[PDB]
Structure formats: structure tokens, C-alpha cells
Design a binder for these strands. Structure first.
Lengths: 261, 261
DNA sequence: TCGCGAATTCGCG
DNA sequence: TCGCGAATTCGCG
């Protein structure tokens, strides 16, 4: 709670900064707050890197590639920091997804459906893709104790409250939030193991079962619950919060740089 | 290696059985081989179940649902067995995916692309969806030591060798296997942590890092490497193999039923 | 070049 | 009914 983020946030709002530009601005704020630490922003990671990180855990892992310069490209990029051993440690990965143009149709008068008949459109499964990148960055961070992955959802397919949109003929159509003809929110909940959405799940839980002990890598899933678009200021504050808690977890491998610089 | 599967396999080939009907036939073979064990086949699992399995690991897990009767429906169903405590243990989950209709276009004469110009079509990312279900059944089986998930890939987007298709005008067009304009095989490799495709990865590896010890749940990804469709006999034999090794892992909780029945 | 992402309508039980 | 899956063309750097 250092005040400087109040100025940064109002900058984002004053410019309608998308997720990618907000993560770039988060890097700026971080280096402003921690001037002796070294941050950077990437817009992609190559599969070779991920595989290289994998076989460092176990020799039999990470031994596959079919397209040589294949890569993943989170539309909000990766913010990293440099630790005391010169290694780069990811402190933020962000992505922003959209589904369900229903509120647009109902705001206007366009009747959708197979025969121009429907008010609503049966929600599709495109949002299932979001699990691939989460898997990639999870495997990338399989040796870290923090998973700083933030997903930002938007659209009529991601409602957490009931909303009423009125047509150009006075017709109030109602979007019922828990309706399985619209709500695709459940399609993401496997990523944080059914832990709460709209919350920062950055620090990894360790759960057991038998002698079977294991680590969970949960993603932070945030929803514009009322159908509207995201406020860049809030989007910014969330990312700053998830990145700082990442820095808290990295605190051991950052000490030298912070005390002697 | 009990012979009976030779007859079963030739049955599948003689009928072109899709993945779902092959898994149903696998159940039949299993109960034929293990007549004192109790198997069953489901075609879906409800999110409530998955959440119920999750909070059995940790109280804070599995506490989310937005659509009440939301479910997942692997197009090859789930084969289970009943253990000595009356509990049902999944021994097989199978799914079959398709991408890249290129070999059809080149077999015929249809030039694709924005202006009816191209021989090839730039491969899309629909195959990324396959990670959701893998996540769901992984969370479902987070307390098991075996992950019996088999994925069957088919299409010009999943080639492991170079193939040559000749047009109705003598034109040999060549599909180069490691071409990143066609090959989407890398889009699955996060599921088995870069371990070998076309192999049975059913038994879970335990890898460490610090004191940080963890369990990996790797999916079996099989490819029709030469673009063609799957032979139901082989598809069958693979599923039977992955399911039996599942039974091997369950061997402790199955003893009573096998010795006293 | 090459390789990555976007998220869509609608069928089906 | 309601809710799940299918996998597609093509833009963009």
C-alpha cells in the first residue's frame, strides 16, 4: 500500500490500457518500487525453454518437439525479475478472454439463432482453449512455489449476477446468471481446483493423500461478473497484487540484490 | 497376452467401431478376463462428483459450481471397476480428436484459402480445448496413482512422417511433417510433460525439486502419424493395455474380490 | 517466410 | 427443457 499505484492506476484508466499494456505498466511500477531489482517484460516463450525447464526436474521429461520454433504467446505477456543467481523468475503471466456477444444483440435488435429468431445464443466451448497455456506455464514453473497466472474473463458467458438488457422496442430481456445456456464459467474452474474465483491464488498449496504428497498450481480467474468490460485501473491493481506476492515468495533468492544495491 | 483380445480386436475392425463403442467393448473384454471383478461404463461425469472428490483431498478445494447439472462428456466414455470397499475406480477414459482436412482437399481438387488459391490451410487452435477434460479427470483422480487417459489424434494437423498426396491433375503436393503451418502436435505435449507420444503413460511419476515432492498426471497421446484414420483393432488393443495396467495399479484394493469370488 | 492466436454458430440428445 | 461438444477460417506480425 505505497500510494504510487494510485497514480499508475489512474493512468491506465485514462488510456483504456488492454491487458498487455497493463502488464507492461506493472513492470514499470515494480521497478519504480524495487529500484535495485531487475525486471523485464516478454511477449512470448519458446517451447524449447519450457522443455529445458522440464528436464531440469527429471531427465525423461521435456523430450518432445515437432515444430522447432514453436512458442506460446499470452496476450498479456510475461513479467520477470532477476534473482541473486542471474536467473530470471516469472512474477506475472496474464491473459484476457472474451465470450458471449449476447448483451450486444439485446442492446441492439439483432435476433440470432438458426432462423433469426432467438434473443440468446447457445454458448460455445472456445473458452476451453484457455487450459493449454495454463498447462504450459505450469510445466514451466513446475519447480517454483508460486503460480502467478491471472485470467481475465469478459462477456455474457461469464456472469455472476443477474442482469436485464432492454431492446430498442422496450423489451426487457433478462440474463439469468446460473443459466447453462449462457454461463461457461465452469469451463475454467479446473484450473484453480474449485477454489474461489475473483481471488489471488498465487501461492501454491501442498496437499497429501497417502504418503502421496503433491503441489497444486492454481490459476487466478477473475470475472467481470456483470457482463461489462474491465476497468483498467482494477485490472492493473490485481496484476500488481499478484506480482508483488510473487516477489514475496521469491524473497529468499532476492535478498542479496535488495540489501547490497 | 491372453488370446481372447485377438477375437475382440477383429470384431472391432469388422465393424469400424468408434472410440466410444471400443471402450464399451473394452469393458466387455475386461469382465470376460476378470469375471469376479465388477466393471461399468459411463458416458459422462457431473461436476458435482469432481468437486466432491476434490474436497475429500482438501476442505478448501472443489467449492465452486455455477451451472448445477454441468458435466463433462468424453466422447469415448469412462470405464470403471468396483474395488473391495464398494468404491468405483476409473480404469479408462478415452477421447478422439480430429483436425486438418488438408489430405481431403489434396486428394480432391479443392483449393482453399482466402481466395480459393491455396493447397494447404493454415492450422487452427481448436485442439487446445482437449486440455480442459484432461484437467477435469486429473482433478477427479488427484488421489489416484494412475492416470488412464488416452487421447487419439487424427488429421493432417497431426503428422509424424512426411506424406505425398496427388491431385486429380497429377500434381504431387507434399505434407512436410514438422511444418508449423500444419503440425499442431505440440499443442498436446503439455499433457504428458514432454514424455513420448504413442506410448502408455498410465502409471504416475513422482518427481521432487527442493523438499518439494510432487506427482505428475501424464496423458497418453496417440497419433495416426501418417494422416490416415485409426484402425479400430489397434485403438482397442491400446485401450485394453492402458486399462489393464490401471488394474495392476489398483491391485491392492482389488485382492479380496479376486481371491474370494 | 512461419507459426500463434481469435472465439465463433449450431447440432444433438 | 438445458447443457455439452464439434473444429472451423483467417488475421497478424
Amino acid at each position: 500500500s505505497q500510494g504510487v499505484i494510485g497514480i499508475f492506476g489512474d493512468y491506465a484508466k485514462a488510456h483504456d490500457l488492454a491487458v498487455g499494456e497493463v502488464s507492461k505498466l506493472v513492470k514499470k511500477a515494480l521497478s519504480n518500487e524495487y529500484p535495485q531489482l531487475s525486471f523485464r517484460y516478454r511477449d512470448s516463450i519458446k517451447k524449447t525453454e519450457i522443455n529445458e525447464a522440464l528436464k531440469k526436474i527429471d531427465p525423461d521429461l521435456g523430450g518432445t518437439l515437432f515444430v522447432s520454433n514453436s512458442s506460446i504467446k499470452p496476450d498479456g505477456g510475461i513479467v520477470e525479475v532477476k534473482d541473486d543467481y542471474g536467473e530470471w523468475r516469472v512474477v506475472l503471466v496474464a491473459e484476457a478472454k472474451h465470450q458471449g456477444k449476447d448483451i450486444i444483440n439485446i442492446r441492439n435488435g439483432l435476433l440470432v439463432g438458426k432462423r433469426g429468431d432467438q434473443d440468446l445464443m447457445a454458448a460455445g466451448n472456445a473458452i476451453d482453449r484457455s487450459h493449454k497455456n495454463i498447462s504450459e506455464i505450469a510445466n514451466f514453473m513446475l519447480s517454483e512455489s508460486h503460480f502467478p497466472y491471472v485470467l481475465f474473463l469478459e462477456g455474457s458467458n461469464f456472469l455472476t449476477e443477474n442482469i436485464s438488457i432492454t431492446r430498442p422496442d422496450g423489451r426487457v430481456v433478462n440474463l439469468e446468471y446460473n443459466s447453462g445456456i449462457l454461463n461457461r464459467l465452469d469451463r475454467l474452474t479446473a484450473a484453480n481446483y474449485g477454489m474461489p474465483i475473483n481471488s489471488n491464488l498465487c501461492i501454491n498449496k501442498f496437499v497429501n493423500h497417502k504418503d502421496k504428497s503433491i503441489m497444486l498450481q492454481a490459476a487466478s480467474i477473475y470475472t467481470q461478473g456483470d457482463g461489462r468490460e474491465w476497468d483498467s485501473k482494477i485490472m492493473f491493481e490485481i496484476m500488481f497484487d499478484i506480482s508483488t506476492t510473487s516477489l514475496r515468495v521469491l524473497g529468499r533468492d532476492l535478498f542479496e540484490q535488495l540489501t547490497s544495491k
